[PDB]
């Protein structure tokens, strides 16, 4: 995020990091329950990647984080990678996350919910702060 | 480029698809929602993470960080997967697995 600010640690407890075998953060995701993470289909996740829950500072060794294996990747059949449309994947964890103050689920909408233009929302992540 | 160690956040507004098309044209589909163009931008490495909106005391996942400006311009809207278009697929999949 360009021109954001640092979060209060643990205050976005559904935010996870998708890391490859080398420990490299390549995408975010969101816990929707103890067993499932929602992410973008274009992130290209497989079962050799891991979900990391409970981080704040990815350079710290002193955080009690959960490095969770992925059992299966469910890319929505409707995903069109040429248009990047329907850009959603579900990750089923091999072993459940343990929910805590810093690890818990985001709500999902009903299909009929209205989110009006002009509403102020929030986005979070470890993406670039400067291009 | 600069990658942060510490988790970042930003407030930003939702746009209508009709208005987002003034930036992005026919790239914008019904299963996308635009947000930003407000002085912040999602950027490389944010993809897959949340766009959440607070109502009735709770945060709901409205978007999933998807794509946008190749330079993370803060005056161009970011594009997010529109969760309302995708949630029937989510609940079923959790139904069945």
């Amino acid at each position: 995020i360009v021109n954001g600010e640092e979060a209060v640690p643990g205050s976005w407890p559904w935010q996870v990091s998708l890391q490859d075998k080398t420990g490299f953060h390549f995408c975010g995701g969101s816990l929707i329950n103890e067993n499932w993470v929602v992410t973008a289909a274009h992130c290209g996740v497989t079962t050799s990647d891991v979900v990391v829950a409970g981080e704040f500072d990815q350079g710290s060794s002193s955080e009690k984080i959960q490095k969770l294996k992925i059992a299966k990747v469910f890319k929505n059949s409707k995903y069109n990678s040429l248009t990047i449309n329907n850009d959603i994947t579900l990750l089923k964890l091999s072993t459940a996350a343990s929910f805590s103050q810093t690890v818990s689920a985001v709500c999902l909408p009903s299909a009929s919910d209205d989110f009006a233009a002009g509403t102020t929302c929030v986005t979070t992540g470890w993406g670039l702060t400067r291009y | 480029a600069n990658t942060p160690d510490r988790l970042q956040q930003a407030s930003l507004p939702l746009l209508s698809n009709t208005n987002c098309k003034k930036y992005w044209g026919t790239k914008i589909k019904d299963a996308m929602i635009c947000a930003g163009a407000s002085g912040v931008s999602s950027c490389m490495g944010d993809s897959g993470g949340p766009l959440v909106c607070k109502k009735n005391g709770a945060w709901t996942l409205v978007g999933i960080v998807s794509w946008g400006s190749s330079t993370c311009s803060t005056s161009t809207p970011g594009v997010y997967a529109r969760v309302t278009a995708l949630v029937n697929w989510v609940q079923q999949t959790l139904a069945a697995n």
């Binding site: 973008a40 274009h42 990047i84 993406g127 | 992005w24 790239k27 999602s42 950027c43 490389m44 490495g45 944010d46 993809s47 960080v65 998807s66 794509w67 946008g68 400006s69 190749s70 970011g78």
Partner: peptide, 4 residues
Amino acid sequence: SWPW
């Protein structure tokens, strides 16, 4: 544009 670019994947984010």
